[PDB]
Amino acid sequence: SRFKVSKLMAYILRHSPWEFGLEPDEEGFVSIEELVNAVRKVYPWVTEEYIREIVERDEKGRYEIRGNKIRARYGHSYPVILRHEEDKESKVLYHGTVRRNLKGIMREGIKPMKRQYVHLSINYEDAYNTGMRHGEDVVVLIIDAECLRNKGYKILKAGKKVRIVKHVPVDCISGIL
Numbered sequence: 001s002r003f004k005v006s007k008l009m010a011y012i013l014r015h016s017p018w019e020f021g022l023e024p025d026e027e028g029f030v031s032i033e034e035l036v037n038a039v040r041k042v043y044p045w046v047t048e049e050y051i052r053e054i055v056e057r058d059e060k061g062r063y064e065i066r067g068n069k070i071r072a073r074y075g076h077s078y079p080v081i082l083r084h085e086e087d088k089e090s091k092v093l094y095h096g097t098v099r100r101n102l103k104g105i106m107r108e109g110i111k112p113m114k115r116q117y118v119h120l121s122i123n124y125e126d127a128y129n130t131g132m133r134h135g136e137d138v139v140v141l142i143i144d145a146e147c148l149r150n151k152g153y154k155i156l157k158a159g160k161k162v163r164i165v166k167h168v169p170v171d172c173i174s175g176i177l
């Protein structure tokens, strides 16, 4: 299924490419031809044409292809430089988290966990679903993205829904849902 193969693509591209003999460049890209060979170790019926269709059809825009190179657009657990197109349009974004985090966030703003980027969403629904990852008592923070930009921070379009930024200062949080 596309779900099973996409789930494995995400794992390879975000988390364990070396396990499959792949060497991502500094931007997270691997050869799509070698990715087929890697995926075929689990699902031998996969074709390059199939992986390309998965990228084209993916609901979240999880993947990016340029020529012979493919990457996950977000979510990597190893260091990547992601020079995505800037979101200069969004006025308000959302960040899902757990209530226990409010104290630190109110003191220090939203910081990225493993350096790199803080994840934001354009939808309140996606942000809540995201916060459920870290526990039951989820709150969604409203982010004034205009304020963020004016403080000098670039918000980048990492997927159809996901937005990434280096840090969110406390002053840029306009509400809690």
Ligand SMILES: Nc1ncnc2c1ncn2[C@@H]1O[C@H](COP(=O)(O)O[C@H]2[C@@H](OP(=O)(O)O)[C@H](n3cnc4c(N)ncnc43)O[C@@H]2COP(=O)(O)O[C@H]2[C@@H](O)[C@H](n3cnc4c(N)ncnc43)O[C@@H]2CO)[C@@H](O)[C@H]1O
Binding pocket: 003, 006, 007, 008, 010, 011, 012, 014, 015, 060, 062, 075, 133
């Ligand atoms: N044993 C493993 N444990 C943990 N991680 C593993 C494992 N093995 C490989 N990994 C990779 O290690 C990364 C983890 O961390 P993470 O990078 O943050 O990725 C998240 C998501 O990434 P994303 O959607 O935000 O882009 C990513 N993910 C989700 N959907 C994806 C897609 N279509 N294509 C590519 N990736 C997708 O799976 C991750 C979980 O997310 P979660 O939504 O809680 O679980 C989904 C579903 O699995 C789950 N569910 C249960 N049953 C069914 C069912 N019958 N049908 C459909 N869903 C079902 O019910 C939740 C609702 O969707 C990921 O790469 C993993 O593949």
Ligand SMILES: [Cl-]
Binding pocket: 019, 020
């Ligand atoms: Cl393996």
Ligand SMILES: [Cl-]
Binding pocket: 073, 074, 075, 076, 116, 117, 164
């Ligand atoms: Cl990321």
Ligand SMILES: [Cl-]
Binding pocket: 098, 099, 100, 101, 135, 136, 137, 138
């Ligand atoms: Cl909590």
Ligand SMILES: [K+]
Binding pocket: 013, 014, 024, 027, 028, 029, 030, 070, 071, 072, 073, 076
């Ligand atoms: K990647």
Ligand SMILES: [K+]
Binding pocket: 086, 087, 088, 149, 153, 154, 155, 156
């Ligand atoms: K921006």
